[PDB]
Design a protein around this ligand. Structure first.
Ligand code: HEM
Ligand code: HEM
Ligand code: HEM
Ligand code: HEM
Lengths: 141, 146, 146, 141
């Protein structure tokens, strides 16, 4: 899927996310639960309130994985093996929910990186996050 | 649709600050950039080959107004989403043959634009609202499909 | 929806030969087999771990009738697709929280079942018809979503 | 995406398609145009009538590619390079139309291979054809 300007562009942009990935991450979580609440279904054990420290907890996890992936663009199926299992196998996440995370994450990025969120950069991040997601449901495919 | 009545006032009061021409154009520019298959339907606008060519393109801008501008109406018209687009749901099915999963695609990039432009004023809750609205519209636009 | 009135007679005359219990069960068995994320919503049926376990499962069959059986009504009821499912479009949104792209998923595997069962009697044209019908239904089932 | 029982299962089933892939192929084309006519949009130069010898022409092409792919399961991005271009780059095929080909192709298979189209085999063919399609739109991703 990923062309080398995609690899380039992704790395570059992730470089600008910086160590905000954690928070960008648990903010992309907030937005999803508000704007697509179908999704909370999957976090019954969680306090979903309006700055839950689990969600906190969680988005650092998610921002962390994302960051790992960036690392392993060339070998994503490997990098996310353990985690393709967790979402595909154990939890059985309807894949359509990746598409909404994805977006809530593009949306977070744009709020905060508005200068940087160029179209170019917008579309790479889209493939990236789409490639990421296929890996995260390949354990269905 | 419905939403809610705080949901309603906050939507409107935003729209108020929305520049239809800037925002319509960038909404459409990304659409074709990010989902390049969309370009089939706009070949008439000539050269779209790279992102700069695209954003610059003047017809692109035009036409993004137009759409932002219809979206506009639906925001103002939330009781009667189908009634409004029927002549354009008509447009879009018969003559152009556009898959509806595109109107939804568009609805999102719109939103992401609005996001970029309003920064932290774009709230979670406020996002939601628009996700409905945009949804609402994307729908009205597939009904009088048949 | 509409369709057409030859389209209508051929649909019905098929349905006539449709065994709701065989066909409902296999429709649902594949759904969970082919799109295993669907299994979340049916964990209560206990063991679904491999295809044989699934097809055998008796609740699975039951319940596939039920659904085939509602589908049934919509085929008989094409004028009033929304009016019919509203209490189940209700079901399916509020209580179960199922994405609609699933009802469409299901609508297709149904069809592929009907295909398997009718061989060359399942025509191109006749397929189309059902693709509408199934569409029609998949839709009525997302309307009184809000 | 593809697990080795998927690779196994795909090969196996394709073995049963035999040299019918051509026709299964231009039959999966007929069904699509009838049941999703949004699609004819892309074959304006074609006679779409009710046994067009272009469509003929065509499905042998498509059955042929499919058959090639089966060949190269381990390296699909390579195998379909030339053809990822043609659909992504030149024609700019809305990907949603792959999902409908796909199905019209599962549907053809079941009509004709009803014994063989077991659920097992049904789901592999689905990944396969889904993997195939990603490759055929990766030149967007
Ligand atoms: C966008 C890509 C995603 C990534 C990188 C991702 C990552 C993660 C990670 C890193 C964990 C670590 C859990 C741990 O060891 O505590 C996890 C768990 C989990 N994920 Fe995601 N996930 C993604 C998307 C999703 C989606 C789309 C959903 C559902 C809609 C989801 C739902 C869950 C659930 C329900 C768990 C169990 C977590 C717990 O109970 O602590 N994730 N995921
Ligand atoms: C949110 C979904 C969409 C909405 C609400 C929308 C809205 C509109 C409106 C209001 C018009 C003017 C129609 C008239 O009065 O003649 C129009 C025309 C047209 N639309 Fe869109 N549109 C949407 C998505 C798309 C997409 C996704 C495409 C193709 C990828 C497209 C292609 C066209 C083109 C090229 C025109 C110019 C036609 C002319 O000048 O007659 N639209 N659309
Ligand atoms: C074509 C789309 C679908 C239709 C027309 C449909 C139809 C129905 C009907 C008619 C009922 C009986 C409701 C009642 O009267 O209590 C029902 C209940 C239920 N449905 Fe579906 N369904 C669809 C798809 C699905 C999907 C995709 C799932 C989950 C993956 C699901 C999960 C359930 C379950 C588990 C029940 C048993 C609930 C009970 O015993 O109260 N349905 N559905
Ligand atoms: C299912 C996977 C598909 C495969 C393997 C495939 C394969 C092919 C092949 C092998 C060609 C060869 C053309 C030649 O050299 O004459 C081709 C061309 C073409 N394909 Fe497909 N295709 C696929 C899906 C699609 C889809 C989804 C569409 C559009 C909805 C499509 C539309 C076209 C068009 C419009 C051409 C130009 C053909 C001509 O004018 O002769 N194909 N494709």
């Amino acid at each position: 899927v990923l062309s080398a300007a995609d690899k380039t562009n992704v790395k570059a942009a992730w470089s600008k996310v910086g160590g905000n990935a954690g928070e960008f991450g648990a903010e992309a979580l907030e937005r999803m639960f508000l704007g697509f609440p179908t999704t909370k279904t999957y976090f019954p054990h969680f306090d979903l309130s309006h700055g839950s420290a689990q969600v906190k907890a969680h988005g650092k996890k998610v921002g962390d994985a994302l960051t790992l992936a960036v690392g392993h663009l060339d070998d994503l199926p490997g990098a996310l093996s353990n985690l393709s299992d967790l979402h595909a196998h154990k939890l059985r996440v309807d894949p359509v929910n990746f598409k909404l995370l994805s977006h809530c994450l593009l949306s977070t990025l744009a709020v905060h990186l508005p200068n940087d969120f160029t179209p170019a950069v917008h579309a790479s991040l889209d493939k990236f996050l789409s490639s990421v997601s296929t890996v995260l449901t390949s354990k269905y495919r | 649709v419905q939403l809610s009545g705080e949901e309603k006032a906050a939507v409107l009061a935003l729209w108020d600050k929305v520049n239809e021409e800037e925002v319509g154009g960038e909404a459409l520019g990304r659409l074709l950039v990010v989902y390049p298959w969309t370009q089939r339907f706009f070949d008439s606008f000539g050269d779209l080959s790279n992102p700069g060519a695209v954003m610059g393109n003047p017809k692109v801008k035009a036409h993004g107004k137009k759409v932002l501008h219809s979206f506009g109406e639906g925001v103002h018209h939330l009781d009667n989403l189908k009634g409004t687009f029927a002549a354009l749901s008509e447009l879009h099915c018969d003559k152009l043959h556009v898959d509806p999963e595109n109107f939804r695609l568009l609805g999102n990039v719109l939103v992401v634009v609005l996001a970029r432009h309003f920064g932290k004023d774009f709230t979670p809750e406020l996002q939601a609202s628009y996700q409905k609205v945009v949804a609402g519209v994307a729908n009205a636009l597939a009904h009088k499909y048949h």
